[PDB]
TrEMBL record:
<feature type="binding site">
    <location>
        <position position="9"/>
    </location>
    <ligand>
        <name>Mg(2+) 1</name>
    </ligand>
</feature>
<protein>
    <submittedName>
        <fullName>Methyl-accepting chemotaxis protein</fullName>
    </submittedName>
</protein>
<feature type="binding site">
    <location>
        <position position="113"/>
    </location>
    <ligand>
        <name>Mg(2+) 3</name>
    </ligand>
</feature>
<comment type="similarity">
    <text>Belongs to the methyl-accepting chemotaxis (MCP) protein family.</text>
</comment>
<feature type="domain" description="Phytochrome chromophore attachment site">
    <location>
        <begin position="9"/>
        <end position="145"/>
    </location>
</feature>
<feature type="binding site">
    <location>
        <position position="68"/>
    </location>
    <ligand>
        <name>Mg(2+) 2</name>
    </ligand>
</feature>
<feature type="binding site">
    <location>
        <position position="67"/>
    </location>
    <ligand>
        <name>Mg(2+) 2</name>
    </ligand>
</feature>
<feature type="binding site">
    <location>
        <position position="151"/>
    </location>
    <ligand>
        <name>Mg(2+) 4</name>
    </ligand>
</feature>
<feature type="binding site">
    <location>
        <position position="151"/>
    </location>
    <ligand>
        <name>Mg(2+) 3</name>
    </ligand>
</feature>
<feature type="binding site">
    <location>
        <position position="154"/>
    </location>
    <ligand>
        <name>Mg(2+) 4</name>
    </ligand>
</feature>
<feature type="binding site">
    <location>
        <position position="154"/>
    </location>
    <ligand>
        <name>Mg(2+) 3</name>
    </ligand>
</feature>
Length: 168
């Protein structure tokens, strides 16, 4: 992004993704997990039910992405875990999730111009949860559609700047 209210319409889109995301799933938390150039994630938007810890504006350094999964998620990999305490996750992984009281999560990728911008992640905090096919599909389409909008909004801004500059 080149700013100048690009970041404005972006945040509005992130907020829509998390709001409609948690509404859809009726889960406890939905966040937008954005990467930097080193693929360190930051929660830039969060919808969370009352009584649960807010994960908003939190920097979480997880190396597994840059080391293993960046390309996979770029290809549209989805990860649905019914119970995080029975998925063979290590303690270091769990310690990131416990303060957020996570019991089950659904991870779908946000791909913008063939780059893994980030992840749309949903949390169930009260108890385990088997995510249904219809839920996974709609949730993935929510993430990818939002990403496509961001993608085409950016090219639109670049086209507008280009056309105005070269105008006779
Ligand atoms: C890979 C991995 N990390 C995450 C991170 C998150 N889950 C969430 O719910 C949230 C929002 C709070 C985040 C962020 C996920 C979902 C995955 C799975 C990717 C996939 O399988 O598609 C991962 N990270 C770790 C942490 C551990 N490994 C380390 O080297 C160090 C250091 C750690 C402690 C910080 C682990 C164990 C995994 C899974 C193993 C792997 O696939 O690499």
């Amino acid at each position: 992004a080149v700013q100048l209210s690009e970041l404005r319409d972006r945040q509005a889109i992130f907020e829509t993704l998390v709001a409609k995301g948690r509404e859809l799933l009726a889960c406890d938390r939905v966040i937008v997990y954005a990467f930097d150039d080193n693929y360190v994630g930051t929660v830039v938007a969060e919808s969370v039910a009352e009584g649960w810890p807010q994960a908003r504006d939190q920097v979480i350094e997880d190396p597994c992405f840059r080391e293993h999964w960046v390309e996979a998620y770029r290809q549209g990999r989805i990860q649905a875990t019914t119970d995080i305490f029975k998925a063979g996750l290590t303690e270091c992984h769990l310690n990131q999730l416990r303060p957020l009281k996570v019991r089950a999560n659904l991870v779908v990728p946000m791909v913008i111009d063939d780059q893994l911008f980030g992840l749309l992640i949903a949390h169930q905090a009260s108890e385990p949860r088997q995510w249904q096919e219809i839920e996974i599909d709609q949730f993935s389409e929510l993430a990818s559609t939002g990403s496509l909008v961001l993608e085409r909004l950016h090219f639109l801004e670049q086209t507008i700047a280009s056309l105005h500059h070269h105008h006779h």
